[PDB]
Amino acid sequence: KPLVGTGMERAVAVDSGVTAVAKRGGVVQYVDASRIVIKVNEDEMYPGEAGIDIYNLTKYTRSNQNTCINQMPCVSLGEPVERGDVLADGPSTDLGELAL
Amino acid sequence: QDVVLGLYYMTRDCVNAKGEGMVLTGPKEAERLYRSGLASLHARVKVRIT
Amino acid sequence: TPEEKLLRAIFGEKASDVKDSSLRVPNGVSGTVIDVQVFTRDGVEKDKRA
Amino acid sequence: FLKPRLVDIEQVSSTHAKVTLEPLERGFGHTLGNALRRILLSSMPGCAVTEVEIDGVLHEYSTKEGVQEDILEILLNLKGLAVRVQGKDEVILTLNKSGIGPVTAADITHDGDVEIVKPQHVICHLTDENASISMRIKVQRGRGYVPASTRIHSEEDERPIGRLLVDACYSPVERIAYNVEAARVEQRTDLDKLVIEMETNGTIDPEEAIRRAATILAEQLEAFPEFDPILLRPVDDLELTVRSANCLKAEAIHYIGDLVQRTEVELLKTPNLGKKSLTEIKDVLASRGLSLGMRLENWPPA
Amino acid sequence: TEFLKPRLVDIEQVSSTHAKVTLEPLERGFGHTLGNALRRILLSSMPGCAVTEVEIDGVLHEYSTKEGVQEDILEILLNLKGLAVRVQGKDEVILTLNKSGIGPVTAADITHDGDVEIVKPQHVICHLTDENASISMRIKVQRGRGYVPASTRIHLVDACYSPVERIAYNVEAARVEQRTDLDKLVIEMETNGTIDPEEAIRRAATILAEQLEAFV
Amino acid sequence: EIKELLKLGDLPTSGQIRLYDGRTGEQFERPVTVGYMYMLKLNHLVDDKM
Amino acid sequence: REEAVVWDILDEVIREHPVLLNRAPTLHRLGIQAFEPVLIEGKAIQLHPLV
Numbered sequence: 001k002p003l004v005g006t007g008m009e010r011a012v013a014v015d016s017g018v019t020a021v022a023k024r025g026g027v028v029q030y031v032d033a034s035r036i037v038i039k040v041n042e043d044e045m046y047p048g049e050a051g052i053d054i055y056n057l058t059k060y061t062r063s064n065q066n067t068c069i070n071q072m073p074c075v076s077l078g079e080p081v082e083r084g085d086v087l088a089d090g091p092s093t094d095l096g097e098l099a100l
Numbered sequence: 101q102d103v104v105l106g107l108y109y110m111t112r113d114c115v116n117a118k119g120e121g122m123v124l125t126g127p128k129e130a131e132r133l134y135r136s137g138l139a140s141l142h143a144r145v146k147v148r149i150t
Numbered sequence: 151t152p153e154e155k156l157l158r159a160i161f162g163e164k165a166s167d168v169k170d171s172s173l174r175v176p177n178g179v180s181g182t183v184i185d186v187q188v189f190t191r192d193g194v195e196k197d198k199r200a
Numbered sequence: 201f202l203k204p205r206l207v208d209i210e211q212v213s214s215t216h217a218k219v220t221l222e223p224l225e226r227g228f229g230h231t232l233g234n235a236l237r238r239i240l241l242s243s244m245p246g247c248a249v250t251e252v253e254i255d256g257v258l259h260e261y262s263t264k265e266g267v268q269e270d271i272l273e274i275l276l277n278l279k280g281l282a283v284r285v286q287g288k289d290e291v292i293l294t295l296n297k298s299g300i301g302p303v304t305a306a307d308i309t310h311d312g313d314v315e316i317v318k319p320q321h322v323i324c325h326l327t328d329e330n331a332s333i334s335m336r337i338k339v340q341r342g343r344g345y346v347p348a349s350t351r352i353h354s355e356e357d358e359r360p361i362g363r364l365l366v367d368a369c370y371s372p373v374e375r376i377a378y379n380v381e382a383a384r385v386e387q388r389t390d391l392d393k394l395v396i397e398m399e400t401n402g403t404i405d406p407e408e409a410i411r412r413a414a415t416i417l418a419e420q421l422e423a424f425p426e427f428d429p430i431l432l433r434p435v436d437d438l439e440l441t442v443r444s445a446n447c448l449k450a451e452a453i454h455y456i457g458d459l460v461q462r463t464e465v466e467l468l469k470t471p472n473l474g475k476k477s478l479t480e481i482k483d484v485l486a487s488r489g490l491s492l493g494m495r496l497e498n499w500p501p502a
Numbered sequence: 503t504e505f506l507k508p509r510l511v512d513i514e515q516v517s518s519t520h521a522k523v524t525l526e527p528l529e530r531g532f533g534h535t536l537g538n539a540l541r542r543i544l545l546s547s548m549p550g551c552a553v554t555e556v557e558i559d560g561v562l563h564e565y566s567t568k569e570g571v572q573e574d575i576l577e578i579l580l581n582l583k584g585l586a587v588r589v590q591g592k593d594e595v596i597l598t599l600n601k602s603g604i605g606p607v608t609a610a611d612i613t614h615d616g617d618v619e620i621v622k623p624q625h626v627i628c629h630l631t632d633e634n635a636s637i638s639m640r641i642k643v644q645r646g647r648g649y650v651p652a653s654t655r656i657h658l659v660d661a662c663y664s665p666v667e668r669i670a671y672n673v674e675a676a677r678v679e680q681r682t683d684l685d686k687l688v689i690e691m692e693t694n695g696t697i698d699p700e701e702a703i704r705r706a707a708t709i710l711a712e713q714l715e716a717f718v
Numbered sequence: 719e720i721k722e723l724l725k726l727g728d729l730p731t732s733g734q735i736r737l738y739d740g741r742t743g744e745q746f747e748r749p750v751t752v753g754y755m756y757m758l759k760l761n762h763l764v765d766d767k768m
Numbered sequence: 769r770e771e772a773v774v775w776d777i778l779d780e781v782i783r784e785h786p787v788l789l790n791r792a793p794t795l796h797r798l799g800i801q802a803f804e805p806v807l808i809e810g811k812a813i814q815l816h817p818l819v
Contacts (some may be wrong), residue, residue: 002756003756004754004755030328031268032263032265032266032268032328033268034263059262062259067761070270072273073268122651123577125584128668129662129667131668132667132668134539134664135545138648148580179765180349182259182261183259184259205716205717226648227542230542231547234538234738234740235538235539238534242530242532243529245503268632289503300713341503344530378743411718416715419505420528421707422507423507423511535741541742542742680772682809765811
C-alpha cells in the first residue's frame with residue numbers, strides 16, 4: 001500500500017478492471033481463493049429468479065508484459081458488503097487502493 | 101561528487117573543535133587522534149610534516 | 151563423411167533419419183510449469199496427452 | 201586487565217530480552233558490543249521450514265478448493281513459522297485439519313523435538329464445511345539465508361513434484377541493539393556496562409545466543425589421467441530396468457566399472473538374474489561401446 | 503552446521519616496522535567485524551611505555567626558550583613522544599639527557615640504564631647550537647593499556663602507549679571454489695618499532711580472546 | 719503539519735536521527751535523514767537486458 | 769554442464785586479457801575504453817566511478 005498517498009489510488013484501483021467490484025450489496029455466502037458468492041439483499045434484488053451474485057475470480061495467468069495477473073479475496077466468510085465495494089484485489093492493489 | 105564531498109568535509113575547518121590548537125609529530129598520530137574520537141576531523145592544529 | 155563413417159561402423163550407431171526440433175526452456179530462465187494447452191488441426195487425431 | 205562477564209538477564213517477553221555485561225574497561229563496550237551484534241545478526245542456528253508437500257497441489261501457483269489462501273500464500277505463511285528442535289537436525293511434521301475455521305500452528309501433530317512457539321500462528325483458513333488439508337512440513341536446521349533457488353544444484357531426483365521447496369529463513373535474531381552506559385561497580389575508577397537488547401522469535405534463549413556469538417567470535421581467533429570417466433558413472437546412468445538395477449546393486453555392483461568386470465558365468469550364478477536381464481545388460485553396454493568381462497586392471501586408483 | 507576458518511595467509515611486510523597481512527577465506531560479513539573490532543583494540547587499547555612527563559632543566563614550563571636550542575620546549579616534547587622505550591620488569595624507569603656540544607642530541611646521548619632499551623639510536627631529540635649550550639634533563643616513562651593524551655591527565659607530555667602508529671583494514675571479495683562470495687581481510691599496520699607489527703596483532707586480538715574467556 | 723505529526727510519533731522535528739555504521743559500530747557525524755519512501759521496481763530487470 | 773573446474777580455467781583466460789567497454793552516445797574517443805575483467809556474481813557490469 002502506499003504509505004504516503006494522495007487519495008486518487010482508490011479511484012485508479014477500482015475504476016480499472018483489475019479489482020473485483022460488488023455488483024449488489026449483501027452478505028458473503030462463500031469465500032474461496034477461486035470464487036466469491038454473495039447473497040443479495042432483498043431491496044436491491046429483483047422479483048424473479050431470486051439469486052445471488054457469484055464472482056469468479058481470475059487466477060494466475062499470462063499478462064501482456066509476461067508478468068503475472070492474479071486476484072485474491074479481501075473479504076471474509078459471512079461479511080457485510082455494500083454495493084460497489086471491493087470483493088477482491090487484483091495484482092498490485094491493496095484493499096481497494098493502488099499499490100504499485 | 102561523493103568523493104569530492106568526502107575530501108571537502110575532510111579538508112575544512114570549523115572555529116572550535118576537539119584538539120583545537122594542540123600539536124602532533126605527524127599525520128600518523130593525527131589520524132590516530134581522530135579515529136579514537138579524541139580529536140575532531142576538522143580542527144585548527146599545528147603539525148610537523150615532511 | 152569418411153571419418154564419420156568409420157566412427158559409426160566402429161561404434162555401431164544407427165544415425166536417425168529424424169532431427170530433434172524439441173521445444174526446450176530458453177537458456178537462463180527457471181520456473182514452474184503451471185499450464186499446458188494443445189491445439190490440434192480439425193480432423194487430425196488427438197494424441198494421448200491431449 | 202579485567203575481563204568482563206555477564207549479569208542479570210532480563211526477559212521482558214517470549215519475543216525479546218536484555219542481556220547485560222558488568223566488568224567492561226575503557227571503550228571496550230563498543231568494541232565487544234558491535235562485534236557481538238554482527239555475529240548475532242549473521243551467524244546463528246535456525247530451524248526454518250524448508251520443504252512442503254501439500255494435498256492436491258502440483259505447484260505453488262494453484263488454489264486449493266476450500267481455502268481462500270493461494271498456495272503461494274500458504275508457503276509464505278509457513279516460512280514465518282517458528283519452531284525449535286533438540287536431537288534432530290531435520291524433522292518432518294504432519295498437518296491435518298478440516299471444517300470451517302482458521303488452521304493454526306497448533307493443529308499439527310506434535311513430535312518429540314517439536315516445540316511450537318506460536319500456536320496461534322495462522323497457516324491458512326478453511327472456508328467450507330467439508331474441506332480438508334493434509335501436508336508434510338519438512339523442517340531442517342541451518343545457518344544464514346538459503347533461498348529456494350540456490351537449493352537446486354545437487355538435485356538428485358526431487359521428482360515428487362508435489363513437494364514445493366521454500367526459501368530458508370534460518371536465524372533466531374530479528375533486531376539487536378547495544379547501548380553502553382557507564383557502570384559503576386563499588387570500587388573502580390571508571391567502567392562501562394553493555395546492555396544488549398535483542399529481538400527473537402523465542403526459538404533461542406538469550407544466554408544461549410549471547411554465548412554462541414562470542415564462541416564463534418573467539419573461534420575465528422584460532423589463527424590470529426588415463427582410463428574412461430564412464431567407468432565411474434553410477435549404474436543408473438546405464439538406464440537399465442528397475443529389476444536389473446536392483447539386482448546389480450544387490451550384488452555390490454554400483455558403478456559401470458564394477459559391471460564390466462563381471463562375466464556372463466558369474467552373473468548367471470546370481471540368485472536374481474535370468475537370461476532376459478543379461479540380454480538387456482549386454483545390449484545397453486554394447487550400445488555404448490562396452491561389454492562384460494572387460495578388464496581395466498587397477499580397480500580402483502583412489 | 504560446521505563453520506569456516508581462513509586457510510591462505512600471506513604476511514607481506516615492508517621493511518621492519520611496517521607490515522601488510524592478508525587473510526583469504528572468511529564468512530560473509532566476518533571480515534568487517536574482525537577487521538574493525540581489532541582496529542579498535544589495536545589503536546585505542548595496547549600495552550606500551552613511551553613518555554608521560556619530562557621535567558625541564560632550563561625552565562619550569564613548556565612555553566619558553568632554552569639557551570643553545572632553537573626548538574621550542576613543546577617541539578622537543580614531540581620528539582620525546584617519538585622515542586621508543588621498551589622496559590623490563592621495572593614498571594617505571596627514569597633516564598637523563600646528559601650531553602653538551604656543538605651538535606644535536608640523539609637517542610644514543612641518553613643515559614643507559616639496566617632495564618631500559620631504546621630501539622632507535624638515530625632518533626633526534628633536539629639540536630644543540632654553538633658553544634657549550636647547557637643541556638640535560640630527566641625523562642619519566644609510564645604504562646598504559648590505551649592512548650592517553652596530555653590533557654587527559656587532569657590530576658605534561660602526550661602519552662603514546664599503543665605502539666601502533668597507523669592501523670587500517672581493507673575488506674575485499676574472496677573467491678573459494680563453489681562458494682559464491684567470501685571476505686578477504688587485509689590488515690595493514692605501522693608501529694613505533696618497539697614491538698613488531700606481527701606479534702602486535704597477536705597480542706592485540708589476544709586481549710579480545712581474554713575478554714571472551716567468560717562465555718564460550 | 720508534518721512536524722506536528724512527527725511530535726505525535728515521538729520522533730524529531732528534523733526528521734534526521736543518529737545512525738551508526740553496522741561495520742565499526744561508531745556513530746555517523748551529523749544527523750542523517752531517515753524515513754519511509756514509497757519505491758517502485760520498474761521492469762528493466764537485469765536478467766532481461768543482459 | 770558448467771563443471772566446477774571450468775571457472776578456474778576462465779580465471780586463467782581472463783587475467784591479462786582486456787575487454788572493451790562502450791556506451792550509447794559515443795562522441796569523443798574516450799567513449800570506448802579498455803579494462804581488465806574481474807569476475808562478478810551478478811548480471812550487472814561494474815564500472816569504475818572515476819570513468
